[PDB]
Symmetry: C3
Subunit: 147 residues, 3 copies
């Protein structure tokens, strides 16, 4: 069937040397392959509201005691451009993680499978166009004979 796994989409952020939340930690979000702590490298981040509206907020993003992103005391869904770097720091200012391009961590790879398939159809379209131009040329020849 088309059935798919039940999952838990809201991310949690945990430390790298012990099993603990990054409580009162900070997340920076930047251009791919840059240092997002530098404001010059930061990109727009937005709360995506329940109704679908978007509100831009400042960086860093704040991680609560549960390891979840919060704004004004509430859980929030933060969105940005698929391709971005991310740096995570704990309340001590120690770096927990750095990801140069979050898009390069996809375990699901149905993008590239599709790109092959698109390239294949384009090849059939080229051959079809070649047949058409040949037919056009046959017609031109006929017209000349009879005219």
């Amino acid at each position: 069937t088309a059935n798919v796994v039940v999952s838990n989409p809201r991310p949690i952020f945990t430390e790298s040397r012990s099993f603990k939340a990054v409580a009162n930690g900070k997340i920076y979000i930047g251009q791919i392959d840059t240092d997002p702590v530098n404001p010059a490298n930061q990109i727009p981040v937005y709360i995506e509201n329940e109704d679908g509206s978007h509100v831009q907020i400042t960086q860093p993003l704040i991680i609560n005691a549960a390891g979840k992103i919060v704004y004004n005391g509430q859980l929030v869904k933060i969105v940005t451009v698929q391709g971005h770097s991310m740096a995570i720091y704990d309340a001590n200012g120690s770096q927990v993680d750095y990801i140069a391009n979050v898009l390069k961590w996809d375990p699901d790879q149905y993008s590239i499978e599709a790109d092959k398939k698109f390239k294949q159809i384009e090849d059939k379209i080229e051959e079809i166009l070649s047949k058409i131009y040949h037919i056009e040329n046959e017609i031109a020849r006929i017209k000349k004979l009879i005219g």
Copy 2:
């Protein structure tokens, strides 16, 4: 290469105000943008067995001390329709989370890239069809001349 990240696909469910599992918590699964606690809004959920078979089970789903979904004392893979709402409650009956449409939390976005590409091929197909109809009309004209 086509190599992709090693990941941990089985979800865990943790609390929202402290870093703890939702031990003996409950998960409800419903139509997109509805309250899944209401039985009228619930949709079928299934254990997907090791052999690929599916067994429908009742709601709520049960979360163990580890924060993993269990049935009859064993870890299970639960499946449902990609588009669904989810509500998670702790053993105290407090709401941990509500997700209106789990599909809208995809960080991987290779669906929409493909939809542009499909629309583009369809455009080439339209132009090809226009050439063909023009050729048909030229042939009709020739037939009339010679007939």
Copy 3:
């Protein structure tokens, strides 16, 4: 917009009977639907370096006190073929999990949507080819009349 959720891509590995990291645990990676503890079933695993280079390493993969994969004392990104089995064991040698095919746990399903769309374009291409062959046959007939 094309905006997508901020997430936490680096996996963490936690126990199945209590809420704890699989500290000093082991991960085996194998062919789909096999027992990856058996070396005969294991497949190549690689560190994907910051610069994009790949270095093959031995199995098992090692899980640190934080539940993250490490090599030579540092966090690492491990890659392999999308389709693989995975088995996870704790420091006691107890099995934490077994996943027959990690690819079958995708909650995002934009592969199969695309495969329908590809099949549909291929159908238009068949009909287009039929029109073309019919036109070719009309031209052959004309040539015979006039020749």
